[PDB]
Amino acid sequence: ADGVGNASGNWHCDSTWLGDRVITTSTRTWALPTYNNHLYKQISSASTGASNDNHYFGYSTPWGYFDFNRFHCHFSPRDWQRLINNNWGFRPKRLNFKLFNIQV
């Protein structure tokens, strides 16, 4: 907990290569609108003229979500080069996620 005038986090974008580990860190700035005017909505392919293969039924939500699942979210092009030229393999190990400096 911080006040109005104190930052709640620092910018960290970095890549650290140690031994058989590489640690990527990426910071981005985001913007979140209000979706659906705070409503849940039944959504469907009804009255879309959809083919049978395209039918669906579901719900749209007021919520947003964070998606970091792509490799350029993490590796820079140079970092990706270091990985692929020097290594027979790699896998993810652990993850850390932070949201901070909220402004409404």
Add this chain to the structure above:
Amino acid sequence: LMGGFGLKNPPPQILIKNTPVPANPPAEFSATKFASFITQYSTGQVSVEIEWELQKENSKRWNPEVQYTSNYAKSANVDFTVDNNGLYTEPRPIGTRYLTRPL
């Protein structure tokens, strides 16, 4: 100026010689130097081990570097290999300067 490491005290010269083996001397003494020797030669193995220290690349450059690479396309031979007669060849000079640094 041809390149490499100038050394006050370089790796020493290593000198090798076949020891002379006289042929059969005459039956009466002569003070003249022997000119007559058994012809011979020698062979063996030699090993050299050098430890090298590396200076790692610290760069914050965003975009990919230039790298030395072999050509991916097909060809009749592979670079830095023997041919069908057993002759090892080196296709080209390879320098050391690929990675970059700010000035």
